[PDB]
Amino acid sequence: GSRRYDSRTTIFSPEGRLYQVEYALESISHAGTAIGIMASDGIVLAAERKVTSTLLEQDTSTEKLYKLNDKIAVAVAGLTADAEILINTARIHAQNYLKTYNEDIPVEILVRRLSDIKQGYTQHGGLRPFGVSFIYAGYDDRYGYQLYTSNPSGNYTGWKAISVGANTSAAQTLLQMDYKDDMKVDDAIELALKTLSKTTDSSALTYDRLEFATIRKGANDGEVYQKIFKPQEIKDILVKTGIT
Amino acid sequence: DRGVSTFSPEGRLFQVEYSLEAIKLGSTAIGIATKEGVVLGVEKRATSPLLESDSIEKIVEIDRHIGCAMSGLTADARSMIEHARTAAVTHNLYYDEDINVESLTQSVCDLALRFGEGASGEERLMSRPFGVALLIAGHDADDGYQLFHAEPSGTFYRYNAKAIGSGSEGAQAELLNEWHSSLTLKEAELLVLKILKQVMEEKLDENNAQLSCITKQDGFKIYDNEKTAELIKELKEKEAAE
Amino acid sequence: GYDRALSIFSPDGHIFQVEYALEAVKRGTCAVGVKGKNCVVLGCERRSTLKLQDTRITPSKVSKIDSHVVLSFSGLNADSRILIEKARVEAQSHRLTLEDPVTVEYLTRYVAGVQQRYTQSGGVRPFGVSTLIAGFDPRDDEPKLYQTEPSGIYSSWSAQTIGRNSKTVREFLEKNYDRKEPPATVEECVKLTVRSLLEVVQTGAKNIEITVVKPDSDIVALSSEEINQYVTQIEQEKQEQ
Amino acid sequence: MTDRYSFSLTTFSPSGKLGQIDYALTAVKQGVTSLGIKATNGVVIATEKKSSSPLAMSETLSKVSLLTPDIGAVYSGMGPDYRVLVDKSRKVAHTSYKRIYGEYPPTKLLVSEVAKIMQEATQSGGVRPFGVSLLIAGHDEFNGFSLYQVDPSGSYFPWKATAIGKGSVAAKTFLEKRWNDELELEDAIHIALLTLKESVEGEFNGDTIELAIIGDENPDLLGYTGIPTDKGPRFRKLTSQEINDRLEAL
Amino acid sequence: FRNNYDGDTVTFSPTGRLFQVEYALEAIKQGSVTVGLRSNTHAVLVALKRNADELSSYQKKIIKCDEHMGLSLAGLAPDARVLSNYLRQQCNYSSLVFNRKLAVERAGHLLCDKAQKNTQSYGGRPYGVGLLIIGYDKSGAHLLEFQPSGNVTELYGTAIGARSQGAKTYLERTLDTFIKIDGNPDELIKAGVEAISQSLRDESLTVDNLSIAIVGKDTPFTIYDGEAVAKYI
Amino acid sequence: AGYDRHITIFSPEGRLYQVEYAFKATNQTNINSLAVRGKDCTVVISQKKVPDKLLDPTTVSYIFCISRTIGMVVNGPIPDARNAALRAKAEAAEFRYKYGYDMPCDVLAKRMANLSQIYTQRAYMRPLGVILTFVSVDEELGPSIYKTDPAGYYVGYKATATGPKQQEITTNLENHFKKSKIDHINEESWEKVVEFAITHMIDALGTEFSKNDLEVGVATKDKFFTLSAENIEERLVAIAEQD
Amino acid sequence: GTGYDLSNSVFSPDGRNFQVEYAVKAVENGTTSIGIKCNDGVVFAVEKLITSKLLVPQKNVKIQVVDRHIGCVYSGLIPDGRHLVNRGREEAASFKKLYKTPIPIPAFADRLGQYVQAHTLYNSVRPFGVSTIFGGVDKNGAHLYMLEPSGSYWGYKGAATGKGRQSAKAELEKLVDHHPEGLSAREAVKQAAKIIYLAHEDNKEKDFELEISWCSLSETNGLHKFVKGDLLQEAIDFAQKEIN
Amino acid sequence: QFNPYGDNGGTILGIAGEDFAVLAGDTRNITDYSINSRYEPKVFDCGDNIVMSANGFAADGDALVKRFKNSVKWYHFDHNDKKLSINSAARNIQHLLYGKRFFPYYVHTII
Amino acid sequence: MDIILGIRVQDSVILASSKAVTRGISVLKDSDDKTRQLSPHTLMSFAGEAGDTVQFAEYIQANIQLYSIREDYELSPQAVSSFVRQELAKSIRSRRPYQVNVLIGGYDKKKNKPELYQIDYLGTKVELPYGAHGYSGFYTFSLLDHHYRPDMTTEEGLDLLKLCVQELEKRMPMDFKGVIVKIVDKDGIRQVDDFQAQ
């Protein structure tokens, strides 16, 4: 029969761990690092592009920062193709919610749903899990600025600052070292770049190897604005923060 | 790997035999059938003093004339009890009468072999056999008082007395000598209480053991602790009497 | 389509996948529940593998199933959500059809059935979760505390604990809980719960969360201070000797 | 009967690798070299027509395929896998876009569709990943010209120029030396021919090389006149003769 | 060897054997003995009911399928229930749709076919029970032997189960004798009990241990147990 | 791990052993066949071998009339060959019904190649151990030869050969065309093209043939047909009066 | 490596399907059965081993009819044989229902052929454990066929399978050479009775029962019928005579 | 349009005595103004000492009786040949009839 | 039909609903409460087809209570009305549509303002200062158009409703057996047990 070739992607190890989830996380640990930092006046998302070339078209590229909503965005660490599958369904759940209640979806509701999808691939169906970890940065009128994280297991948690991908142990220690509750978006932007700068497995930290985004509530307006920095914009903020 | 409905070289179904092993590890359950009714007793076997012993339900009512005791992976018996209760009530709705104890048993046993990953015979959607055995006891106009042993093998035997669970081999040997066609309900009660006391790791009392019976007149009843405590006291006295 | 039997019997009569599901529970953060004479308290511990979390938004360990019943657990977090959602849905269904909220035993029996079902259904693995369900039956003042495990087995406890080092805290409760005189007060009941956790939490004011449930849907979670206060008064009970 | 392989055939190994994807990539490496170069007013994609026998009629086998009138594709790896992928890509461009909006999809979105199809063969039950890497070149009003690479995992990335297959490493290096953001289409074609020559062992002419471009609108390839807004396809496969003409200026 | 080719019924061994089927057959041998024989006017089924404890009953081994047909089982009881139930439906269908009693030979063909399906498809398992079918139809008395392999054979008499070889040799000897016991049921049964006692060893057939069934010319398939079989012990 | 050789998933080298072993099965019949294009016809030659004397020679064939205009010769076991023939016939008939015109040889070839590609990618389906050669005189393309294999690959040929001694037939044909400088047999009658076909079959295999050692299929405008023992004998005689 | 013979649709390194080959073994271990094509029909005959005196004589018929003009006999696992004929019968009824005319033997053969070939395409099924000799008379003559577990089949002048297939084939080949003009239905029957008696030597240990059937345009009107009574005994003797 | 029902006439009578009971019916079967048969039994012995008649549309009446007889047969099979009591048969017939609540057996039945 | 009225004043929303339940020739009940509380600050009144009416109301009630527990938050009145409109908009194109009309009166604790929504069985939703379903609007809208003021107090609103009910009791042919009145504001939902003569 077929049973012979079934890897059994959803079983417990004798220690009560889920093989595939653990192996997927291992996979993620080799993915370009992504960082999330929440400030009093906004959220910062920064990620390092894994592998690049002179010929790679960076202006048209996006492999780590995705807009889910006009108020929610995610930073990706893992298989990009897997990520897009989840991002697309997340974008759809947001609109279903909007059409049903005529209100933008609260950030956690959307994160929980996506995490539930992931959890499913963990308990039934016999399929491999998604090799993806997300950092969600969003804003709603119940909790304001929020930062969340979800991984292959389907578990999610909220943070003030956090990282996913490669060298999170190192990156986390650095963040825990310089983070301060009363930080400001600009402070956070700088902290993010410094952290990546020290954990990079590459020579230097140039703009062509970064993606940057911020969710702020532009004082001169009253609404929330997501900004996905452009190559030149990253290059600038990179010189300013003293990294040239 | 290997199919869940594979035959051993000796002509036995692996999953069923392994199932029987789990049942041996279960709490003891005993049943005695007499011309005055059938008694069903079980070992509560709580795992900690903080566990409220009366929340342990190993003896349940199927219908007014049928009761049953379980041994093994007890969580597995819930759907079996459910099926049984539905079967009995359904029979009454269709025939305006009580379901015969044997028919009720045969119906429960029909679920037994309904397991596998795609067995060509119908739609047996159950990944493994039940890991619990049951003693179905009751009364009906045609065959009077009856005691049945329903196993995960789908086979059910009728007994005059039967013990299942960890102390079964020992307890069964005891029932062999003690049982006779003229036992009174009271004798059966003490007799069940005595055998449970012998095979139980703990000192039998009205909290870690439970009795019940079913009689044509009052149907199935679970003895409350006080009633059992007295019977226990009465047993100790007759024993110390010689 | 996928219906492989993942939970089957082994030669010695064990279902390893259910067995390993328990190992996942032993790995989860500790949870405890003790019933007083007029209330039930639920305490859980907070991991520290990583600290820099946003406590406001990070999912708490105790969840309300209905306004009079709560559920805590030890094990896979992702798994618990599935059971929590099903329990909540069932709670509303029961109210809609019976015109009465669920009893604690009913809600427990439901969650337990879902767990049992996942142990003998093709294509699915058992839940790596054990739960503590507490509350008060509608129009009743008698406290209720039940526990469920991966196999689907359940029962009520005067007090119980699950998760890592629950062996330790259970002992504490076994030699510190008198059924003769249960914590006659919300305060002394909350104290006994924090005491039992301190046996394993190792100084963790922010690593210990309590939730008090009283009759008639009176449920509330304590704040760091309120708890920190209990801790403080307890360390003195020791030093004062 | 009935496909009973409802479980993944690609799974994570203790190291975090997805074996089947790696192996698929290995198959791509053994494939004949193919490349793409983006110019300021066009894009070129080319590959070698590795005739498997002199009796075979190489024309009856196009490695360079038109997906939409402004998008074309080429590949490296398993030709059969590519062939079905082209059938599916041509279809999704319709079912998921033209039938909805009445216009052809922009290059990035069709690439996204193709990529999804490939990602699914990496996780769906009972299948193996596609053993190919594609290079899609196209043009759309709001994005201009573009060039993308899609790998067996379903991941894709935009390029200014790149190569895949057998001698990709060498070819990429050679492209980095000659590429600049001011190349005209003819320059790119020329550069393409030079890069491809290093990868070809035997004969190098318009009968052994296959090349297509995404450039200006060919109103002559439309088939009808009468609608001002319809100017013709931008995709055009070069003829054997057109290739040879340019090989003399090599 | 064997171990690599007996994991399921969809696998042939290098010599062309089907072990799962063979293992199923082994369940029959382990089953209690039962005998079947016929004259030209009747067909009889004699089966030794086995008991678990001395406090247990002696499991029924004979099931009536219709007024003119019935069988005896040896092996997995549940499988016998499934198969006899199927036979009951087929007999029923024949009556309701064609107002025709099902031919014993037709029943045999149906059973063979139902069992065969459970030996060529993945996921299923062969039936682990043997059956002896007796009946009286438009061509007289009939006795059939059903094996899980799907092989069904018509005989004058036979036996299946443990030590069945005893009764079988006896009947293969007594043949010319019993085949002529027409018009006399008691004799046919007695001959049946004599063939079965040829497979005893452990004990001797008692009252709550013997089970007999008969069918024929003017006798609807009926089952005798206990007191009713006393006059044959 | 070692199962990457039982079902169709990649091996660490990026190979599909089942497809490879399927190619191996194509030679099981130890038969060789070749096809050539005439000026306005397409001929296919295939060895015929009837070992058992108890066989009815008339029922032993590896050539099939797929449609009124398409012929197919199979190199591989007969059961897989007949499976392929039935599918191709159904496909050809359906195409006509849905699109209003006869399915072209190359299109049917692509269709069968795609089906093959599927067995290559889905685990529950095994590849067919056969190589299919399709021929016809397409209304748009003229004489056509298109062949498909267990890999889902397919292409058009000027001429082609398949079987154990495929290489020898191929080089022989290659040589003839390097010489003629044209991509077909410049003969007006199919009878002469059949003769050419058989002549080179003989040269390449270095063997003589009787009328019952060959099997021939011919495709002309609006019709594909197989030759009889006698039609063939008449062919063998003609070639004899030249050597 | 190895293990190519554990799953049904797997190609071994030399391009074989071992499970089909093992099925063949089940066939060679079976009773011998044959078929002889005559000038206007076909004859079928088979060996029926008498396990004991208990088997009612003449009762356990093995030859089967499909529709009203086709005869089928097989060697191997009998139940697999019946299964294949049941399909054949549905296949025949379906053909007649749509086309009105009873199914031509060649057409019928491919129907059985495709079905058996189908059982060598998946590992969820097992190949057929029988070789089948069948045939009959139709619009243009009589046809004899033999189908192997691989789905392979061809038209035959004479055919045999089972334990004594060699003896039979030997005997059959003799008849072919000594009768280029064609045997008659009457003659083929006797000849058949003999070939079976002869071929019975490879199993001379057990006693047996002969079974014959035929379909002749002149002797049965093109309908399949069993050889019974006088005509049967006559052939039995013709055999018993030439066995000495 | 096709009418799935018809009327075969007939009349039936059931009277219960202290220790006996009778079920009578004429034997005439009709269609409109024609007689289909002067003798077509309409009251049947269904075994277990139960007689039944389903009068009205004969096709429906036959189907019902036939279904109930088959019901008695299986009652025996499924409950160790227990005798089906008249009250149990009644409840059983109720379910047979209500099963076609939305496409009724057009008959008046008496046992 | 029954009487279903709604009025949104300065700091609350009031819903008046007839108490009669008539079936054919007889008035079976004269104390029927045609309302369901969806959440502490959201009330829904309803009228329409005999069984659909309550089944629908309770179904919505169940869904909103489930949302409240899951999110431990109370959906805004606008969100709840959108959920209800979509349920009815699906229903109208289903096999057997819910023939129920509703008024949703809720106090938005975030905006600190009362809100009244009128939605018919087709899924037609509109937000109004006051509304009704059935013939009720025909007799009462001219009165509301006249006396209505955005700054009215709950007390003034009750007086305006009383006037409407009196017009309904004078000109309407059916005896709807008075109305039950409920107020929804920042403190929840309460019933005016005294309207039988206010």
XYZ file of N, CA, C and O in Angstrom, chain E residues 95-170:
304
model
N -36.562 -13.607 -2.672
C -37.973 -13.796 -2.361
C -38.830 -12.587 -2.724
O -39.835 -12.721 -3.427
N -38.443 -11.412 -2.237
C -39.203 -10.198 -2.498
C -39.274 -9.804 -3.971
O -40.351 -9.493 -4.474
N -38.143 -9.826 -4.665
C -38.126 -9.435 -6.070
C -38.582 -10.503 -7.061
O -39.318 -10.198 -8.001
N -38.158 -11.747 -6.862
C -38.538 -12.814 -7.780
C -39.485 -13.874 -7.223
O -39.852 -14.803 -7.947
N -39.878 -13.748 -5.954
C -40.786 -14.723 -5.341
C -40.153 -16.105 -5.522
O -40.831 -17.100 -5.783
N -38.838 -16.145 -5.356
C -38.056 -17.344 -5.572
C -37.106 -17.602 -4.423
O -36.421 -16.694 -3.959
N -37.060 -18.843 -3.957
C -36.144 -19.173 -2.872
C -34.745 -19.280 -3.473
O -34.552 -19.872 -4.535
N -33.775 -18.688 -2.793
C -32.406 -18.688 -3.270
C -31.776 -20.082 -3.324
O -31.814 -20.838 -2.347
N -31.195 -20.414 -4.475
C -30.535 -21.701 -4.663
C -29.273 -21.753 -3.804
O -28.473 -20.808 -3.793
N -29.087 -22.860 -3.091
C -27.918 -23.014 -2.239
C -26.636 -22.790 -3.029
O -25.674 -22.212 -2.528
N -26.628 -23.235 -4.276
C -25.453 -23.066 -5.110
C -25.201 -21.597 -5.427
O -24.052 -21.173 -5.594
N -26.280 -20.826 -5.520
C -26.189 -19.401 -5.817
C -25.632 -18.673 -4.596
O -24.799 -17.768 -4.717
N -26.094 -19.082 -3.420
C -25.633 -18.496 -2.174
C -24.130 -18.702 -2.065
O -23.397 -17.804 -1.661
N -23.676 -19.899 -2.423
C -22.259 -20.197 -2.358
C -21.464 -19.272 -3.256
O -20.376 -18.815 -2.885
N -22.000 -19.000 -4.444
C -21.333 -18.114 -5.387
C -21.246 -16.690 -4.821
O -20.234 -16.001 -4.974
N -22.321 -16.252 -4.171
C -22.368 -14.915 -3.606
C -21.353 -14.757 -2.488
O -20.667 -13.739 -2.414
N -21.256 -15.757 -1.618
C -20.302 -15.707 -0.514
C -18.877 -15.685 -1.055
O -18.038 -14.905 -0.603
N -18.597 -16.546 -2.020
C -17.267 -16.575 -2.603
C -16.908 -15.180 -3.086
O -15.844 -14.659 -2.763
N -17.804 -14.574 -3.855
C -17.558 -13.246 -4.393
C -17.378 -12.168 -3.326
O -16.525 -11.286 -3.474
N -18.163 -12.228 -2.253
C -18.036 -11.221 -1.210
C -16.699 -11.344 -0.493
O -16.085 -10.339 -0.124
N -16.245 -12.576 -0.289
C -14.972 -12.805 0.387
C -13.794 -12.438 -0.505
O -12.792 -11.898 -0.033
N -13.908 -12.723 -1.796
C -12.821 -12.433 -2.721
C -12.401 -10.974 -2.715
O -11.214 -10.680 -2.800
N -13.371 -10.068 -2.612
C -13.093 -8.630 -2.612
C -12.159 -8.214 -1.473
O -11.356 -7.272 -1.614
N -12.265 -8.931 -0.356
C -11.442 -8.680 0.815
C -10.090 -9.409 0.747
O -9.510 -9.742 1.778
N -9.594 -9.668 -0.461
C -8.299 -10.333 -0.621
C -7.500 -9.722 -1.775
O -6.375 -10.147 -2.054
N -8.066 -8.722 -2.439
C -7.385 -8.096 -3.569
C -7.271 -6.578 -3.415
O -6.678 -5.904 -4.264
N -7.824 -6.048 -2.321
C -7.815 -4.608 -2.067
C -7.116 -4.191 -0.770
O -7.267 -4.822 0.280
N -6.362 -3.102 -0.860
C -5.624 -2.556 0.270
C -6.577 -2.047 1.357
O -7.688 -1.605 1.066
N -6.148 -2.126 2.612
C -6.979 -1.636 3.699
C -7.920 -2.641 4.340
O -8.210 -2.552 5.539
N -8.412 -3.591 3.555
C -9.315 -4.584 4.111
C -8.559 -5.787 4.639
O -7.336 -5.855 4.562
N -9.289 -6.738 5.199
C -8.672 -7.946 5.709
C -9.576 -9.085 5.291
O -10.777 -8.894 5.091
N -9.012 -10.287 5.134
C -9.842 -11.421 4.734
C -10.760 -11.753 5.891
O -10.517 -11.329 7.028
N -11.829 -12.484 5.613
C -12.723 -12.881 6.685
C -11.982 -13.993 7.420
O -11.288 -14.791 6.795
N -12.096 -14.027 8.742
C -11.416 -15.060 9.507
C -12.373 -16.102 10.062
O -12.367 -16.410 11.265
N -13.208 -16.654 9.191
C -14.166 -17.647 9.638
C -14.505 -18.627 8.528
O -14.447 -18.286 7.339
N -14.831 -19.856 8.930
C -15.198 -20.889 7.980
C -16.687 -21.109 8.132
O -17.250 -20.895 9.217
N -17.342 -21.534 7.062
C -18.774 -21.744 7.143
C -19.210 -22.996 6.416
O -18.670 -23.338 5.354
N -20.191 -23.673 7.003
C -20.783 -24.867 6.407
C -22.247 -24.489 6.164
O -22.990 -24.193 7.111
N -22.651 -24.472 4.897
C -24.021 -24.100 4.556
C -24.858 -25.282 4.099
O -24.450 -26.034 3.213
N -26.026 -25.450 4.714
C -26.927 -26.531 4.335
C -28.250 -25.923 3.922
O -28.664 -24.882 4.446
N -28.915 -26.576 2.982
C -30.199 -26.071 2.539
C -30.956 -27.064 1.686
O -30.390 -28.048 1.209
N -32.249 -26.808 1.511
C -33.098 -27.659 0.689
C -33.788 -26.731 -0.311
O -34.605 -25.896 0.074
N -33.448 -26.859 -1.586
C -34.048 -26.007 -2.600
C -34.725 -26.815 -3.709
O -35.124 -27.952 -3.490
N -34.863 -26.234 -4.894
C -35.511 -26.933 -5.998
C -34.714 -28.101 -6.578
O -35.120 -28.702 -7.578
N -33.576 -28.421 -5.970
C -32.782 -29.540 -6.456
C -32.401 -30.444 -5.292
O -31.429 -31.197 -5.359
N -33.177 -30.358 -4.218
C -32.945 -31.200 -3.060
C -32.073 -30.666 -1.944
O -31.972 -29.456 -1.722
N -31.443 -31.594 -1.230
C -30.570 -31.260 -0.112
C -29.207 -30.813 -0.607
O -28.723 -31.287 -1.632
N -28.588 -29.903 0.137
C -27.286 -29.376 -0.233
C -26.433 -29.043 0.984
O -26.942 -28.617 2.025
N -25.130 -29.244 0.835
C -24.162 -28.929 1.876
C -22.991 -28.245 1.188
O -22.455 -28.741 0.186
N -22.601 -27.102 1.736
C -21.519 -26.314 1.174
C -20.471 -25.982 2.221
O -20.801 -25.771 3.398
N -19.208 -25.944 1.798
C -18.134 -25.567 2.707
C -17.524 -24.273 2.174
O -17.058 -24.209 1.024
N -17.540 -23.248 3.018
C -16.998 -21.945 2.661
C -15.685 -21.631 3.381
O -15.595 -21.737 4.613
N -14.677 -21.237 2.609
C -13.385 -20.867 3.173
C -13.109 -19.388 2.856
O -13.433 -18.912 1.762
N -12.507 -18.649 3.812
C -12.162 -17.226 3.695
C -11.396 -16.882 2.431
O -11.375 -15.731 2.009
N -10.748 -17.876 1.840
C -9.998 -17.648 0.616
C -11.017 -17.319 -0.456
O -10.684 -16.771 -1.511
N -12.267 -17.666 -0.170
C -13.338 -17.421 -1.114
C -13.742 -18.702 -1.817
O -14.664 -18.707 -2.634
N -13.050 -19.791 -1.499
C -13.341 -21.089 -2.100
C -14.538 -21.756 -1.429
O -14.548 -21.970 -0.210
N -15.554 -22.058 -2.235
C -16.770 -22.700 -1.744
C -16.955 -24.020 -2.484
O -16.891 -24.062 -3.716
N -17.187 -25.093 -1.735
C -17.338 -26.410 -2.347
C -18.576 -27.159 -1.894
O -18.926 -27.124 -0.708
N -19.236 -27.837 -2.832
C -20.424 -28.610 -2.482
C -19.984 -30.036 -2.168
O -19.245 -30.651 -2.940
N -20.454 -30.552 -1.037
C -20.081 -31.884 -0.584
C -21.268 -32.684 -0.025
O -22.362 -32.142 0.176
N -21.042 -33.974 0.230
C -22.071 -34.841 0.811
C -21.954 -34.654 2.312
O -22.919 -34.833 3.061
N -20.749 -34.291 2.740
C -20.491 -34.073 4.150
C -19.079 -33.568 4.377
O -18.218 -33.711 3.496
N -18.836 -32.976 5.545
C -17.511 -32.459 5.867
C -17.471 -31.865 7.266
O -18.479 -31.864 7.989
N -16.297 -31.373 7.648
C -16.111 -30.759 8.962
C -14.977 -29.737 8.926
O -14.017 -29.872 8.153
N -15.102 -28.706 9.756
C -14.085 -27.665 9.838
C -13.859 -27.356 11.304
O -14.739 -27.594 12.141
N -12.675 -26.834 11.603
C -12.335 -26.506 12.975
C -11.198 -27.375 13.489
O -10.548 -28.096 12.724
N -10.952 -27.306 14.792
C -9.891 -28.093 15.397
C -10.231 -29.578 15.374
O -11.363 -29.964 15.653
N -9.247 -30.404 15.027
C -9.425 -31.856 14.999
C -10.545 -32.276 14.055
O -11.071 -33.387 14.152
N -10.909 -31.381 13.146
C -11.976 -31.658 12.191
C -11.643 -32.867 11.328
O -12.542 -33.565 10.853
N -10.350 -33.117 11.133
C -9.900 -34.234 10.305
C -10.471 -35.568 10.786
O -10.637 -36.505 9.999
N -10.779 -35.647 12.077
C -11.344 -36.871 12.614
C -12.675 -37.162 11.945
O -12.831 -38.158 11.225
N -13.636 -36.272 12.178
C -14.972 -36.399 11.612
C -14.939 -36.557 10.095
O -15.709 -37.332 9.524
N -14.038 -35.830 9.446
C -13.939 -35.871 7.994
C -13.604 -37.259 7.444
O -14.247 -37.719 6.494
N -12.608 -37.930 8.024
C -12.243 -39.274 7.565
C -13.408 -40.229 7.820
O -13.718 -41.081 6.987
N -14.051 -40.075 8.975
C -15.194 -40.900 9.335
C -16.298 -40.793 8.279
O -16.827 -41.803 7.808
